[PDB]
Design a binder for this molecule. Structure first.
Ligand SMILES: CC(=O)N[C@@H]1[C@@H](O[C@@H]2OC(C(=O)O)=C[C@H](O)[C@H]2O)[C@H](O)[C@@H](CO)O[C@H]1O
Ligand SMILES: CC(=O)N[C@@H]1[C@@H](O[C@@H]2OC(C(=O)O)=C[C@H](O)[C@H]2O)[C@H](O)[C@@H](CO)O[C@H]1O
Ligand SMILES: C[As](C)(=O)[O-]
Ligand SMILES: C[As](C)(=O)[O-]
Ligand code: NA
Ligand code: NA
Length: 719
């Protein structure tokens, strides 16, 4: 036909990839079989109505916008198979007619220009328009240009401006990040289908906004942080959509009359290296960056990581030289380190499957274990740490006056209340820990690392920002960093100076100035670990075996707790600097995804959890322990003797831990007094410090979380 048809061909090759199908290809045949099964269920349940109320009973209530998108996506699946020579529905007359009559019908009494948004705007402006564009693009050889325009006009009505969304509403918003990229998958493709040049260029010009790094608001930051929805850490969900979608569009956009400059897109590599890579551990995308996505059963950590990975791979594929090789190496190593999730379970197009296969089999592409790293995403109040030598990841989830604690929207993530109240994540040998139903079964009132009262919480509640701006991480190098959070709980009835000292192969948790003005009880959850019935843990308290029950047992005068597995890479030890009074329990916890996300299944799910907590019955209480993972029993026992005097101070104004072996100090100061440390030096400014001594020279890393600035050494360090 023309260049528009040419671009749409490229698009079809990216969103479906039928030209790349090979029946002898196992992974490919598996996706084909899934699509076959999907079309057969749709065609068999579609109402052979005499013009009935709906096309599919399951998606009948057209008041629930979700049903418009689900319906058109079923037609897209049909379009994918009708153009697949290997599908039993290839060129099938009844499927071609079902798709054509279904479009005329939906366009008749459900989705048209004379309609208004009912329910979610996203379905009307992104979900449905994408499914329609894809359906028409794939089956453009069965539709007339006039029919195509006819079926896309409704998209032009709901989405006429490539710069704003919710345009037909009373309060539209500027499109950026993930939503802006979907604006390209909506208007660039519809523009191609309609052969509308102004639409194409105006939309590509708008998408280019996505390449600019920001220092405020939504978007990617220089330090690797990604914020969306005003002030929510969102690299792992909206960022996913951003890279996933942009990578599909680029090859098509780059072949139109409005290609995008090569230096404008150079920031893509910054996202990959600074924003995405640090959040990927053993093939898992850290949940602290996925917002409300965590409450979706079909998008657990390893699954969400493939959206990013397939996006990175595409980018690598259209790159060249060492950039291509290096990105290739990045994707290869991450995928191969994932022994838990089969990457192919989330590569939904033949070209994506093909790319992955050749990548994994090309001996020319290096696949070397990733090195140690520590990212202080201070612009989104999150910190990611990875130790390659011992093999564990650590995630610190916080929030402040600059960021929302959790997102509960569209009935999703109803109980994420405390997922940012100083919650921590440990990524060890059990790659499935935060998967297999962790979210719907974890007790939402006892999120690991958090200090909270036992007051009941409502599902209808929504996120809040923190009163204090004193939240931040001072990074010294790839293995050492210190963080603090001037914590106040949701109803301002409890406070705590929570601090963390990341010291290469361990993390110290310090909390002081714990006050409670309410009548509820306060306690800090040391941990709530999801167990594997296959790899049971042998629990020790003070080095003596302990038998945990469903009922809470008290362990006063506890100096240590050790969780021993047959696999040392799953071991977790906790060393209490000062004998502490803790309680522990191991109980089967049940729940359903629908409990935390209305749109999910109410099918019962269950998992065994080991919970460790320390109550705080008096004002001015505190806690202090070192988390030491991946070492065996004897090594842990030897290490706690070494750390005997690692606690320097832990009060209302000063918290510090010293790593004698490393010669590294972690310090948090809440005021400007002169603090003398280990009779060696003095720190003089309120803020966060990570200091290392090398001979008589001192390496200083200082960060004032409030002003988001460091300071000349002579201002904060002395002697
Ligand atoms: C509360 C408000 O002003 N608007 C609500 C819609 O929110 C917009 O949605 C998104 C997005 O969905 O990515 C980004 C925008 O920043 C945000 O203002 C919301 O989607 C709908 C449906 O829940 O209700 C509006 O009131
Ligand atoms: C980032 C986010 O949560 N976006 C919401 C949509 O979720 C994404 O949907 C798709 C897609 O259908 O292509 C891909 C992603 O993995 C998933 O996170 C969600 O479907 C819609 C409708 O509820 O709302 C968006 O805000
Ligand atoms: C807003 As609601 C229904 O999830 O509680
Ligand atoms: C139902 As409710 C919001 O009280 O949990
Ligand atoms: Na309630
Ligand atoms: Na509710």
């Amino acid at each position: 036909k023309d260049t528009y048809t040419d671009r749409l061909d490229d698009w079809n090759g990216i969103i479906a990839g039928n030209q790349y199908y090979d029946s002898k290809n196992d992974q490919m045949a598996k996706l084909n079989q899934e699509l076959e099964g999907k079309v057969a269920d749709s065609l068999s349940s579609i109402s052979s109505q005499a013009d009935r109320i709906y096309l599919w009973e399951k998606f009948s209530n057209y008041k629930t916008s979700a049903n418009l998108t689900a319906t058109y996506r079923k037609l897209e699946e049909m379009a994918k198979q009708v153009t697949n020579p290997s599908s039993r529905y290839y060129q099938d007359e009844t499927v071609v007619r079902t798709v054509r009559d279904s479009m005329e019908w939906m366009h008749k009494h459900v989705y048209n220009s004379e309609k208004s948004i009912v329910g979610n705007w996203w379905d009307y402006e992104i979900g449905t328009p994408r499914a329609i564009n894809n359906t028409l693009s794939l089956m453009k050889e069965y539709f007339s240009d006039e029919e195509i325009k006819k079926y896309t006009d409704v998209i032009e009505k709901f989405v006429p401006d490539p710069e704003h969304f919710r345009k037909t509403t009373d309060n539209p918003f500027k499109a950026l990040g993930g939503n802006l990229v979907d604006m390209g998958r909506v208007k660039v493709i519809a523009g191609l289908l309609r052969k509308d040049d102004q639409e194409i260029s105006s939309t590509i010009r708008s998408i280019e906004q996505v390449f600019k790094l920001v220092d405020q608001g939504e978007g990617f930051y220089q330090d690797g942080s990604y914020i969306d929805h005003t002030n929510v850490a969102y690299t792992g969900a909206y960022g996913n959509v951003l890279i996933d979608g942009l990578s599909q569009l680029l090859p098509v956009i780059q072949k139109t009359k409005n290609p995008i400059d090569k230096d404008k897109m150079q920031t893509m590599y910054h996202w990959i290296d600074k924003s995405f890579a640090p959040l990927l551990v053993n093939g898992e995308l850290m949940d602290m960056s996925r917002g409300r996505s965590i409450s979706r059963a079909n998008s657990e950590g390893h699954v969400a990581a493939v959206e990013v990975l397939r996006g990175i791979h595409r980018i690598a594929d259209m790159s060249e030289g060492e950039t291509k090789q290096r990105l290739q190496s990045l994707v290869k190593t991450i995928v191969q380190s994932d022994s838990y999730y089969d990457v192919f379970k989330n590569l939904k197009t033949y070209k994506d499957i093909s790319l992955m296969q050749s990548l994994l089999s090309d001996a020319g592409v290096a696949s070397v274990p990733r090195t140690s790293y520590l990212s202080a995403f201070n612009k989104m109040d999150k910190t990611a740490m990875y130790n390659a030598e011992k093999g564990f990841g650590f995630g610190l989830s916080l929030f402040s006056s600059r960021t929302l604690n959790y997102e509960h929207m569209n009935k999703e993530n109803k109980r994420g209340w405390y997922t940012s109240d100083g919650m921590f994540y440990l990524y060890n040998g059990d790659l499935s820990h935060y998967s297999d139903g962790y979210w719907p079964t974890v007790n939402p009132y006892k999120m690991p690392g958090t200090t909270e009262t036992d007051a009941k919480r409502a599902d209808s509640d929504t996120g809040k920002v923190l009163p204090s701006a004193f939240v931040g991480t001072s990074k010294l190098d790839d293995a050492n960093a210190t963080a603090t959070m001037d914590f106040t709980n949701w109803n301002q009835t409890l406070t705590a100076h929570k601090s963390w000292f990341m010291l290469k192969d361990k993390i110290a948790f310090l909390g002081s100035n714990i006050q409670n003005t309410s009548t509820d009880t306060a306690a800090t959850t040391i941990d709530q670990r999801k167990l594997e019935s296959s790899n049971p843990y042998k629990v020790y308290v003070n080095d003596k075996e302990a038998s945990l029950t469903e009922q809470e047992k008290d362990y006063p005068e506890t100096q240590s707790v050790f969780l021993e597995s047959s696999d040392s890479k799953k071991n977790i030890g906790y060393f209490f600097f000062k004998k502490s009074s803790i309680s522990m329990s191991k109980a089967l916890q049940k729940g359903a995804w629908k409990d935390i996300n209305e749109g999910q299944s109410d099918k019962e799910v269950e998992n065994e959890f080991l919970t460790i907590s320390q109550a705080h019955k008096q004002n001015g209480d505190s806690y202090g322990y070192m988390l030491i993972p991946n070492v065996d029993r004897a090594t842990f026992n030897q290490m706690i003797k070494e750390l005997e005097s690692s606690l320097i101070e832990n009060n209302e104004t000063l918290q510090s831990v010293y790593d004698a072996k490393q010669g590294v100090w972690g310090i948090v100061k809440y005021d400007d007094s002169v603090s003398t440390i280990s009779n060696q030096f003095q720190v003089l400014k309120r803020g966060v410090y990570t200091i290392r001594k090398e001979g008589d020279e001192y390496k200083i890393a200082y960060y004032n979380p409030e002003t988001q600035e460091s300071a000349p050494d002579q201002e904060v360090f002395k002697k």
